[PDB]
Amino acid sequence: GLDIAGFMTLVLKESLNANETTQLVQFCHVMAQLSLSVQTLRLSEAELS
């Protein structure tokens, strides 16, 4: 449940969160999963765009 604005604000914040840090690492794991799926499927730049 984090937008990009909240994303970098809480990143610049030095992990001042109890469970929102867990939310942030879940966000990062989700983007990692998407990137790894893209890499496995060999989806191209133009297709993804």
């Binding site: 191209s44 730049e45 133009a46 297709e47 765009s49």
Partner: protein
């Protein structure tokens, strides 16, 4: 006699080989994408020459 075989059951007509369709090759090509430029920032005029 009914199935048109020999005395020991060997077929009297040679079974057709039924040559398969065999596989085919695969091809891939290139994909391109286009973009524009960034907004030109008005350069803050210095005093130097």
């Amino acid at each position: 006699l009914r199935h048109n075989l020999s005395i020991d059951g060997q077929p009297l007509s040679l079974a057709i080989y039924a040559e398969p369709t065999d596989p085919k090759a695969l091809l891939t090509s290139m994909v391109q994408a286009s973009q524009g430029g960034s907004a030109v920032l008005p350069g803050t005029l210095s005093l130097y020459r």
